[PDB]
Design a binder for this molecule. Structure first.
Ligand SMILES: Nc1nc2c(ncn2[C@@H]2O[C@H](COP(=O)(O)OP(=O)(O)OP(=O)(O)O)[C@@H](O)[C@H]2O)c(=O)[nH]1
Ligand SMILES: Nc1nc2c(ncn2[C@@H]2O[C@H](COP(=O)(O)OP(=O)(O)O)[C@@H](O)[C@H]2O)c(=O)[nH]1
Ligand SMILES: [Ca+2]
Ligand SMILES: [Mg+2]
Ligand SMILES: [Mg+2]
Lengths: 440, 69, 426
């Protein structure tokens, strides 16, 4: 019951999916061939990890996941990688020609040729669910497939599944690892198109993750592998409530109730701690208070913005490991009297806390140290609008000259779609200003 | 109160169906409009290339006329 | 796979085309017999972009050789890699073009264009997923310029949704003395603006200057010039031929490099350029942005950069490369357009070129390329105002109107580059 289906779109979505599902298997003791010796119920069950894994008669635990890309090379690495036996071949869907960093090709020209097949495969997973709860869509903002095809899929999912929950993990572009000049275009187009079809979206700023790996892990030039290992830890913390059971465990939907005050205000800010190397973590145990305090250090956020210059509409703490409420309450009380935590006047100031007792896991050969306790903070702050503002400014500079627009018009799009998408972003920025204004 | 309870759940059904209907119609309009626009751009490109072929035939025909004299 | 179909037309196109295949075959470990004797799996991971695989593990280049005379192509077949090309892919005439664009474009090339299209169609049918075409030719001759532009339009007619890439060799008085080369170049440029997605401007004026001023060659031969071309062509196709994230295919390159459809003429650059008789990343980065290292005779500091693609090859610190690329952009911010943010993209390939520990290849879309077109236009108008040698063109069926239209379109291209050079964010 309460099954969740994960959809990984484009290179960024697929490769992040590799890190997440490898981490999930390590957390649940699932072998690369899908066997889970600790699972005594063969062929099925209603355990907490069954929300993300289905079970075959042969004892294989199969991810409730679909990998989609318009180009085969990235998913071909999954088909021949370490976890190739984990997925049925029909879960890995590939085309022959990608979207070439063009939203129009991903949404219309190339995406329309594979969209029906993807929905059919998604339907096959849904038919195996007795209590399907929603979808988790992993994609980049800047890629043609991650932007164009994701928005097309989200529109189709709303039609075929009504108002069933759809959550995003969205990769916000950064110049350090970006691959296209038109990424601000694809970002604005996909945000506008997906906005009414998404219930909750966790943005991951590649620059924030890039800086954390350099600063906290002493990685000179972080790779996608470095970034994805860190991203999967945040994703694991967010989904740990769905995959594990505990007395102090709080369901993600319960957090989602506090995080979304209006349908369009559904972009939580994520902060994760501790991110520390093995050398620095040796003989240095970080307490509940220390990791909680690091959640309010802006250098640890997954999106670059300054919450101290904005207002809070929700604050959630998702602990995992050796954590008890007594230490949480004392740590929160210390933070309340030492941090710039200003709430809007129409929202309660209490912090919502969840604890999963299962300790954090690390992929062998990685850079993250294995710690006894970790925390991910999910906050709804007006400061996340700064991420929209930076993206919208880049959009305006190019669109004032209509630079690169012919690549989109040539694939069938119109200039009206650009202005309509930009106006929606301008309204979205205005919405974040309005919710921060004090009541009269 | 029972009548109000029926009206609330019917209202939720109607709004959910209307959202599905609007999403389906908006997408179909976009996909059809995009298909026409892309085909129009390709048709214009091919027409210009055909006009180049017509010009080339005119040029070659013009050479035969002067070669006779 | 994502296949590219290679076409070389005319004497210049076949010459530089042959050297290009020799260089990349060595990089991919392909011998003249088409067999693989390399030692790195990275050589064969994307080998199908430029090579077909035949019986006996033979790698046959996906190349089509075109000329209106058998002379150049016969010597290519007698070259070091002449036996690696498919014999049926040789399509040559007998009459020739006589350095007349009309004969290549209208009279003689048109008689041979259909036979070339049959070979193009055969190679495209056996493609799993065709990217497009790359053409090597010169603009100053008759066959590469005339029939080369004719082939582009005819291929564009049957493959309108594929990328058309060209390596165009710009004529210069310092290399060849055929006085109607400005005519042939202007007529060809009139076609390249409309029917190509991306064109590399290989300027013989810059090639001669590099060989003379920098390489200290008093009498530069065509082999000396072509050595620069082969090194440049290997660098600009590195992202296509090896695993990588940036500009891995022709269309993604075009999307990152072409902000406006007509402004698709690139300024290539290569580093190091040292003559017969240890290099650092900052020196390599600074050198590739210098005007003396450009393969087009244009000073980038006389214009502004719309988009730039940078490729580093060899074993080096990627942290250092990122720092130096940021450093050169900050120190030269005035020369990059502000209304295209993050317009410089950098790629690093582990495998260096032959004989070099480290190298840098520069691909730039700069408004200073108008200097190249101004030089051609100035030479064009010096003769067209006197109507010199026009009967050689009008005798094939052309008229003075087509010359005027070609001149105006190229003058419009210069104006458009100046427009976006003067454009401001505010
Ligand atoms: N964090 C992270 N970001 C990635 C990864 N791969 C790509 N990106 C980012 O995604 C953006 C480009 O989108 P991609 O996912 O690579 O492209 P795509 O979705 O496959 O779409 P097309 O290739 O154009 O058809 C850039 O901003 C990259 O920095 C990854 O593995 N991890
Ligand atoms: N760089 C270089 N340029 C060449 C070569 N051969 C010819 N050219 C140039 O091309 C122009 C003449 O074009 P050509 O190839 O002879 O005409 P075509 O054979 O009819 O296509 C002149 O401006 C030459 O400078 C070569 O091998 N290398
Ligand atoms: Ca079970
Ligand atoms: Mg991709
Ligand atoms: Mg010649």
């Amino acid at each position: 019951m309460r099954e969740c289906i994960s959809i990984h779109v484009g290179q960024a979505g697929v490769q992040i999916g590799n890190a997440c599902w490898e981490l999930y298997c390590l957390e649940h003791g699932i072998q690369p061939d899908g066997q889970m010796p600790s699972d005594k119920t063969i062929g099925g069950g209603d355990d907490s990890f069954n929300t993300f894994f289905s079970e075959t008669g042969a004892g294989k635990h199969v991810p409730r996941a679909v990998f989609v890309d318009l180009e085969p090379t990235v998913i071909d690495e999954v088909r021949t990688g370490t976890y190739r036996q984990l997925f049925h071949p029909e879960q890995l869907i590939t085309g022959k020609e990608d979207a070439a960093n063009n939203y129009a090709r991903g949404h219309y020209t190339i995406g329309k040729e594979i969209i029906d097949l993807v929905l059919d495969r998604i339907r096959k997973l849904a038919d195996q669910c007795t209590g399907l709860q929603g979808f988790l869509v992993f994609h980049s903002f800047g890629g043609g497939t991650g932007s164009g095809f994701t928005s097309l899929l989200m529109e189709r999912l709303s039609v075929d599944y009504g108002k069933k929950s759809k959550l995003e993990f969205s990769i916000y572009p950064a110049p350090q690892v970006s691959t296209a000049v038109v990424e601000p275009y694809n970002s604005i187009l996909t945000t506008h198109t997906t906005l009414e079809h998404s219930d909750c979206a966790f943005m991951v700023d590649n620059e924030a993750i890039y800086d954390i790996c350099r600063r906290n892990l002493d990685i000179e030039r972080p790779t996608y592998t470095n970034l994805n290992r860190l991203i999967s830890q945040i994703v694991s913390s967010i989904t740990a409530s769905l995959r594990f059971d505990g007395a102090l465990n709080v369901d993600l939907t319960e957090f989602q109730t506090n995080l979304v005050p209006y349908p369009r205000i559904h972009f939580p800010l994520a902060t994760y701690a501790p991110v520390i190397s093995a050398e620095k973590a040796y003989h240095e145990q970080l307490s509940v208070a220390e990791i909680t305090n690091a959640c309010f250090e802006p250098a640890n956020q997954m999106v670059k913005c300054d919450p101290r210059h904005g207002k809070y509409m929700a604050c959630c703490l998702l602990y995992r490991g050796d954590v008890v409420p007594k230490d949480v309450n004392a740590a929160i009380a210390t933070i309340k009297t030492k941090r710039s935590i200003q709430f809007v006047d129409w929202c309660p100031t209490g912090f919502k806390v969840g604890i999963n007792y299962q300790p954090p896991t690390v992929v062998p050969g990685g850079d993250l140290a294995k710690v006894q306790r970790a925390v991910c903070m999910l906050s709804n702050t007006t400061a996340i609008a700064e991420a929209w503002a930076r993206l919208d400014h880049k959009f305006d500079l190019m669109y004032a000259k209509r630079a690169f627009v012919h690549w989109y018009v040539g694939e069938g799009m119109e200039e009206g779609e650009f202005s309509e998408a930009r106006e929606d972003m301008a309204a979205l920025e205005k919405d974040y200003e309005e919710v921060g204004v004090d009541s009269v | 109160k029972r009548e109000h309870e029926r009206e609330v759940i019917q209202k939720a059904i109607e709004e959910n169906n209307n959202f599905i209907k609007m999403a389906k119609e908006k997408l179909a309009q976009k996909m059809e409009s995009n298909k026409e626009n892309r085909e129009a751009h390709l048709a214009a490109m091919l027409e210009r290339l055909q006009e180049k072929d017509k010009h080339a035939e005119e040029v070659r025909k013009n050479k035969e006329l002067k070669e006779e004299a | 796979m994502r296949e590219i179909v290679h076409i070389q037309a005319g004497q210049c196109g076949n010459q530089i085309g042959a050297k290009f295949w020799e260089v990349i075959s060595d990089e991919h470990g392909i011998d003249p017999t088409g067999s693989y004797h390399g030692d790195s799996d990275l050589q064969l991971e994307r080998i199908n972009v430029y090579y077909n695989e035949a019986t006996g593990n033979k790698y046959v280049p996906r190349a089509i050789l075109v000329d209106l005379e058998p002379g150049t192509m016969d010597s290519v077949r007698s070259g070091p890699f002449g036996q690696i090309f498919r014999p049926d892919n040789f399509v040559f005439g007998q009459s020739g073009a006589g350095n007349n664009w009309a004969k290549g474009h209208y009279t003689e090339g048109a008689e041979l264009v259909d036979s070339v299209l049959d070979v193009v169609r055969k190679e495209s049918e056996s493609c799993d997923c065709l990217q497009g075409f790359q053409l090597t030719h010169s603009l100053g001759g008759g066959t590469g310029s005339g029939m080369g532009t004719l082939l582009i339009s005819k291929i564009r007619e049957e493959y309108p949704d594929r990328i058309m890439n060209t390596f165009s060799v710009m004529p210069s008085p310092k290399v060849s003395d055929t006085v109607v080369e400005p005519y042939n170049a202007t007529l060809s440029v009139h076609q390249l603006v409309e029917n190509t997605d991306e064109t590399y401007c290989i300027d013989n004026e810059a090639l001669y200057d590099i060989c003379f001023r920098t390489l200290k060659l008093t009498t530069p031969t065509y082999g000396d010039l072509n050595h620069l071309v082969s090194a440049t062509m290997s660098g600009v196709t590195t992202c296509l031929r090896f695993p990588g994230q940036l500009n891995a295919d022709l269309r993604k390159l075009a999307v990152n490099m072409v902000p406006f459809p007509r402004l698709h003429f690139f300024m290539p650059g290569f580093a190091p350029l040292t003559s017969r008789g240890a290099l650092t990343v900052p020196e390599l980065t600074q050198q590739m942005f210098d005007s003396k290292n450009m393969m087009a005779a244009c000073d980038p500091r006389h214009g502004r950069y719309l988009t730039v693609a940078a490729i580093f090859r060899g074993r080096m610190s990627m942290k250092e490369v990122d720092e130096q690329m940021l450093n050169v952009q900050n120190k030269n911010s005035s020369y990059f357009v502000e209304w295209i943010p993050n317009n410089v993209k950098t790629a690093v390939c582990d495998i260096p070129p032959r004989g070099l520990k480290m190298s840098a290849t520069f691909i730039g879309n700069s408004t200073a390329i108008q200097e190249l077109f101004k030089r051609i236009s100035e030479q064009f108008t010096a003769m067209f105002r006197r109507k010199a040698f026009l009967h050689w063109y009008t005798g094939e069926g052309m008229d003075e109107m087509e010359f005027t239209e070609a001149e105006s379109n190229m003058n419009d291209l210069v104006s458009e580059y100046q427009q976006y050079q003067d454009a401001t964010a505010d």
